[PDB]
Amino acid sequence: QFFDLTQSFCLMAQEALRRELTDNGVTFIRGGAWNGTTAGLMAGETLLL
Amino acid sequence: GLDIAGFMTLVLKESLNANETTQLVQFCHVMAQLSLSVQTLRLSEAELSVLVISGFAVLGAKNQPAGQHNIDTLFSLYRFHQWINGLGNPGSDTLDMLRQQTLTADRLASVMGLDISMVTQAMVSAGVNQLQCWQDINTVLQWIDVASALHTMPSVIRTLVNIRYVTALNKAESNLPSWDEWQTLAENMEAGLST
């Protein structure tokens, strides 16, 4: 649940950045952090990147 | 008589049905029994995921799709696990070609490390034209198991079994070999004998 919450917050942050820089193409959160093979472990590091 | 969504909805229900709680405790207990089965059989992530996603179509059972909760399913699953462990490393991606219908005879023999011709003979004797399901694969396994058990060809074990020893009815028919056919069968059968 916590990872879902922070994924929501990260995407909110990305959209805020997109508005600030007025360029709607820049993407960094491209999925795959919740790696189901490893119980969705260690996504915090990907989000930190 | 339940699905998972309903499982959840009546679980959030504070048990508003008197006799439904009985089947819910039974439902929980059957998950307990299935988990006990997979644990004792020591099945791992990948093959169980393959079997579940395929819905046990890649297992096959008698008169019952996917898999029921009887001894037949347990036996077949244990056999498949033993085989999948004995596969080695490449056998894992063999499961891959099992997930789709690419499971072909020559690659099967190559990964087995045995002779292709043995598998051809088992295919023609077991009557199986393609390994749709683990029914076919398991039957070919048992045919080759018999052939290697006697240290001989699958064709001649097919033929020996083919001799309906009923001798002009009381069964299908008399498959009694002719005299020379008998001699040739014996010749070939005893060929793999020591000094």
Binding site: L11, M12, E15, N35, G36, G44, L48 | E45, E47
Partner: protein, 97 residues
């Protein structure tokens, strides 16, 4: 039967000891599965640096959660192994009895 005067055979056989079985080896068996899908992004009300710092502390909390989870997993696993070893010891002791 070409024996002695008392039935002792004149020819001795061989045992023909088998090849003995083989120990099965387990391989890493893996089924490839994808990660979670991207969700659409709606828009916030704070400006960029504030959200930067708040998400920063949340992600730090999440990462320490992950590492704590892993340490739990390790301790659990070794604990299981030691219980298994004790079981094997018990049965071996019975056989030695």
């Amino acid at each position: 039967h070409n024996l002695s005067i008392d039935g002792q055979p004149l020819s001795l056989a061989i045992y023909a000891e088998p090849t003995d079985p083989k120990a099965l080896l387990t391989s890493m068996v893996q089924a490839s599965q994808g990660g979670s899908a991207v969700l659409p992004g709606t828009l916030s009300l704070y400006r960029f640096p504030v959200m930067l710092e708040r998400t920063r502390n949340l992600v730090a909390q999440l990462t320490q959660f992950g590492t704590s989870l892993l340490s739990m997993a390790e301790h659990d696993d070794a604990d299981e192994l030691t219980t298994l070893l004790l079981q094997q010891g018990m049965e071996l002791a019975t056989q030695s009895i």
